[PDB]
Design a protein around this ligand. Sequence first.
Ligand SMILES: CCN(CC)CCSc1nnc2c3cc(F)ccc3n(C)c2n1
Ligand SMILES: CCN(CC)CCSc1nnc2c3cc(F)ccc3n(C)c2n1
Ligand SMILES: CCN(CC)CCSc1nnc2c3cc(F)ccc3n(C)c2n1
Ligand SMILES: CCN(CC)CCSc1nnc2c3cc(F)ccc3n(C)c2n1
Lengths: 394, 394, 394, 394
Amino acid sequence: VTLCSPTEDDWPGMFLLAAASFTDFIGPESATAWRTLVPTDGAVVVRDGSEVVGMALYMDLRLTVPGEVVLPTAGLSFVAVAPTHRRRGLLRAMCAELHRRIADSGYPVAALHASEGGIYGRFGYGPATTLHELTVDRRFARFHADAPGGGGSSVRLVRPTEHRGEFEAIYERWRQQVPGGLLRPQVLWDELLAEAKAAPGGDRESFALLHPDGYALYRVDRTDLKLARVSELRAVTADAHCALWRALIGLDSMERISIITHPQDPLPHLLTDTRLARTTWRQDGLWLRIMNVPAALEARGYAHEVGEFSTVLEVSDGGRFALKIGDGRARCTPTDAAAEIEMDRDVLGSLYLGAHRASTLAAANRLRTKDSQLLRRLDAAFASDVPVQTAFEF
Amino acid sequence: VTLCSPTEDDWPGMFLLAAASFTDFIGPESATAWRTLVPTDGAVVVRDGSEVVGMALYMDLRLTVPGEVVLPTAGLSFVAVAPTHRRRGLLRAMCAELHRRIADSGYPVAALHASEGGIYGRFGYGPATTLHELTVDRRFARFHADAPGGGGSSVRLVRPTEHRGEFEAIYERWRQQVPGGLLRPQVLWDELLAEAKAAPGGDRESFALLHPDGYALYRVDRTDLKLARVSELRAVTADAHCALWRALIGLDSMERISIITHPQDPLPHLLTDTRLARTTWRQDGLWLRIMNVPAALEARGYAHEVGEFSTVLEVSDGGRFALKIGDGRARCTPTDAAAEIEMDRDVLGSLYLGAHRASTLAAANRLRTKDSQLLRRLDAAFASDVPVQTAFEF
Amino acid sequence: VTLCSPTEDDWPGMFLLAAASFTDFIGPESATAWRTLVPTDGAVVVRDGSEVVGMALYMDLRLTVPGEVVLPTAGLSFVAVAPTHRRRGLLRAMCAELHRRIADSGYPVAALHASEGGIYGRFGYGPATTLHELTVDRRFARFHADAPGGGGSSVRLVRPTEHRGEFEAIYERWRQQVPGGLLRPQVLWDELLAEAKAAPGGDRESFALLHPDGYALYRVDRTDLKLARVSELRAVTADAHCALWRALIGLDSMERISIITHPQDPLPHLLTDTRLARTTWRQDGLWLRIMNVPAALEARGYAHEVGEFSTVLEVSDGGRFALKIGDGRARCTPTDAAAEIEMDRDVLGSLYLGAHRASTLAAANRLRTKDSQLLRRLDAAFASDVPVQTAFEF
Amino acid sequence: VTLCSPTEDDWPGMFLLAAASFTDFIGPESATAWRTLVPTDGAVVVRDGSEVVGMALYMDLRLTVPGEVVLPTAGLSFVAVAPTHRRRGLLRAMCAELHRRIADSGYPVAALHASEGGIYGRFGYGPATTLHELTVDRRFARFHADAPGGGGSSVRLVRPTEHRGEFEAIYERWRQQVPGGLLRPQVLWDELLAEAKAAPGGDRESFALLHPDGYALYRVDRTDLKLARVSELRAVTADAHCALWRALIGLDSMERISIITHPQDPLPHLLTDTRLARTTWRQDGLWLRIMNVPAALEARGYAHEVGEFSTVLEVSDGGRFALKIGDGRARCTPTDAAAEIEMDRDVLGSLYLGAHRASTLAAANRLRTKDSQLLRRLDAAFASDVPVQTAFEF
Ligand SMILES: CCN(CC)CCSc1nnc2c3cc(F)ccc3n(C)c2n1
Ligand SMILES: CCN(CC)CCSc1nnc2c3cc(F)ccc3n(C)c2n1
Ligand SMILES: CCN(CC)CCSc1nnc2c3cc(F)ccc3n(C)c2n1
Ligand SMILES: CCN(CC)CCSc1nnc2c3cc(F)ccc3n(C)c2n1
């Protein structure tokens, strides 16, 4: 049981473990595309005696954080232990080696999507963004008198494949402007438009709604032909967001439109009946591990409505820092002064993009302090002006 | 078709319309208890030719708003139009007469629970609190190392009826301290403990978990004998909240615990796996209509982390005001100066308890302003330190 | 946290814990009937500081084992830990005290029904009888030419309550003759005929099919009015068993008859289409803990078709014995000779009534031996001529 | 309406009737592979006026029976009557002609899988093996301290297609050793690995778990992506059986593992909680018709624990025999002595592999005798040491 970087001969074995481990695995050509996003020495495999029984890698990603700041981010993915080698500490060993490499490469943060919610908190990952599924009963949906775009429509119904360039440009603007935003490279746009084709005995053809400042990708569900699934909706202005929803509610053959969006999606407020946009499903999105506390805390913007304050943050087994926050900027310096706020590294990941209130984590004792005032100040300071969203699964 | 205050002879006809209109109606003795909360001239009926075909009333309630301030509140309830008299404007007429009486009596706000979400926005009511149903799969539920109370338990399993006094005192402390809090009078405690008994071919016996600083009322579901429904959980400290959840997760015969709680419930953060507390259901709770804008805005506390700022708020058909917010206090005076922020009265109701961000309503154009800075300032100012909750249905 | 025998004042607290712990709990009058079957010092309670947070008791039962031998049996029941006192070792402590008392009273075996299947093996209990639910689609059911009773019917349709004496006598004959048989006292016949009445918004009226040598109790399901549930069918001869099934298949208004029976129920072989009697559900019934290995092994009959053989059985932490089995009788004496067969005490409980083959437990390594021949000999010796059945839940 | 052997021109018509009659029919190339297992004059067709409206054939099979004895077996299959020619006695006529040919060729037994359970008993076929579906909730599954293989795993995760030779050799060992075992020829291994590929809009890719002494083939279900279906698990030792189940329980992405196995599968006993392996489904497997009673009875081994005994067996319309069973061997000679045991030919098929107890068939009067002692002796004699299993559907 050796742990090392895969050579070219190891990848066929990794694709086998992938096929066996991941129900969403497409195949080798698809996996070879994703592979272009893995840097030299971004992958570890565990071999036995030699077949691959363990793998983990990170991709080079660019994550937008509050203040429209873009951080280089280690995107953890393709993590699998062979079912024949469970409870053998192959995960702990592989995660430890990737975190060593990520830390030493100068990534301030690492991110992942969790297949399960009870395995990543112990490695320093906290849930940082929230997914909401909204299901609209569009037969009762009337737009409010106040809703924008209520002449002729600026939204066009188009073949996704013929307007790639327009989607790329709209997404590029979106991701630079929104916390949770990720740069989407060429190979992930190749994959998105591939998954947009009708598969024989699979998914149905996908259509696009195209606005100068927004797009929605949607398809009719395989089995329920009265449900339209919005796979992606990216709007840069409120005009674009409302116009795309007028078009989607205009799908008169459908009973229901479903979308995975965020808790602050304004759609419910566009309707005379907020309740018609039901929350069916709610889950953690992106998980963040802060690799370097001072680098991360200093890199993001803070609320400019919070008055300058100072405190001492202890991260368990992650350092103690004098934290000065003033006019949306933070300075974070080593100190041995008595801590005023204590928290595990994962709790910091959860606060970092403004998705979770410090008051809430405090109420669960994930975040300790004997000062209510400091709690309110952290809450306000760490809050994000632009609501935090999830870019894409990796 | 006359509109007037009911005499004693009208109530049997009102109970008939109630039985026909409300599936949760219990009977005349129950209705006569609720009736003790209706003031002289708090009820209107529409008679035809004379049977009752229309009714509406308000109860005298005490609503806690941010800053632990208690407002007298007109609680709208028992609103019904006979199915034989629909689309005859009996609602508009009855609501108009009650709002006249509520306004002239000096209630700063009115509140209701909506049977439907598309009928109260036009009368100036905005959704002000959010209900979340959490369902825990308690077979996988492990408390975090950081979770309080992890000697001997301070929680007791008791018959609800034998510890009324302890529940009353705990609730009384809870309601004075939490936005959305309502004073619960004697007759509503009589009703709560009545609905806690096993009904022949109805609900099962209810049990209580009693802590010095919290209680939970729970029962096993009628049909699914592996599901425990928490009807009420009121905790005054984080210790009480966690201890009651250790006890509920200790119901080893159950697969699932379900509760109606709020979006900021810390329970998910008490567990090693946040995902085990799934959000199954999400809906508007209390709806608020601001009867007097200056009285309401001046009565609540504001975030003390927001720096003093001034603006002009126009409420559509509800006045224009110079709004000065400073050190958690507001002054609100008539002005004819140009408005900087415009919104319908219902949008103000939605902001009033801090459940909805001004940024979100702005993104839907329910709230108009050409100043991003003022938007962030309203967001921070109107936010509530203590998370907003729903007391009880009326 | 004291462990002691309950006084008269403790029982109200025990009934409270019962109501909270058991969804099948009826009430105090019912519990007080069952209580008549608990001997002096048959109950333990754990008090805190004083409310009951723990209880366990055994009832005095008479269990028929192979060879039509009746053993005094400690029937463990009414076992509950308050949800506020989990993971505090109250079960281990209570079970240890009852086993001390059971052992010292001279019970050779103890029995229970398990609410869950993963908590009793560690206390020496093994699953000893198997329940099968058969569901017959009676619309296709034709009896075989070979099936008995195919003049006039000897089966009568009767009110259960008017023929108590006939049911008692038939059951008394059944239980003396069948492994798994339990003596049913007067108070359990009072309970059976009570649960046979229609409950307002509960179960429907129960009817009896009465043969000189058998009865079936049945009722129509609460919700599915095309399903008849056979609550109990006790037949002393094959004639009685077939006649009662001709009558049940004669319920022409029903689509389905369901019964909880045993794996060797001959019903499938009474039909031209064995498949029409589908096995819907299968579970452990009675669990046995052997309190005294030599007393238990010497008390039961063995297959007379197995030729005299000798071996050494080691029960883990339960003694080592020279085991001589010959002409359906066993002698079991202390030895220090090398063991030829090793097994935990629970594995012995599972073998004791002939429901599980030694070969099967061997294949799972629950039962160790380096002799295939001895395995076949144990299999044949421990097999029961009369198939093993479950009497009633306690 | 003529009955004869098909010429080469009849097969296209037979494939048409197959496609119309069998939902599991794949196509002509697949059918042409199976056809290689049909001997010269193993097929009958009924032509009308000339399209095929009737067909039946047998394949040459090798069935392992108790005592590890391999019998040549007529495997009845591809039996269909056109829906236009029902109730015309085409089945009775075709079955009669194949049984003539099977008898005259010197097959001691014939076997089939029944599409329905009420049509083959009248032709002398009795259900001889039992299928159990086990569904494991693998999230709660913990192996017992006693379970084998609890260093490094000897189980490998492999592509089925790359380890054909290893599966063939393991199966060949399995089938020679187990009652119900069938030789699987090359063309049935071609079919098994063909059905193991992912079909576009069909089944998902199949994976193998490979041990030196066992394999499991498994795939994720089409629709329920949290369920793994074990299509085949063949273990030669208990070590192999437990190791393959440690691997399957190691599929951490799945909630449920389902397998079609036998009533004596030791899996439930490998777990701390036997109940986690639920029996969801139970059905007849292989059906046996004894073509030659003396040849069949003399060919199988009997329990060596049963003391030499003699009796007279009458098979209805199938002969009367002096049956002497001693030291696991039987002699079966014509007699006209008074019968002591009577049964239809199908009842003998059901007893032949030890799946059904003579006591059980006696209790249903499918098997007549006025001697309890002889019944116990038949039970013990006919019982199989190695538990009876089902090889593959034909
Ligand atoms: C997470 C969203 N899924 C679509 C439903 C992903 C498609 S399946 C797939 N295949 N190879 C890879 C892969 C290969 C690498 F070398 C690195 C990362 C990869 N990811 C995320 C992969 N995902
Ligand atoms: C809203 C919560 N329900 C319990 C499920 C209420 C119980 S049914 C009922 N009956 N009379 C009244 C009544 C009579 C009045 F005069 C005034 C208000 C009333 N409410 C809310 C009532 N509700
Ligand atoms: C197990 C079958 N159930 C019927 C569905 C039982 C009815 S509820 C009940 N109540 N008190 C008792 C009780 C009281 C005792 F003191 C001792 C044993 C008891 N059991 C089994 C009890 N069961
Ligand atoms: C019973 C298991 N099924 C797989 C699900 C079988 C695959 S479909 C099929 N096609 N042709 C034949 C066939 C052709 C012959 F000439 C003889 C036997 C055959 N069987 C069983 C066949 N089965």
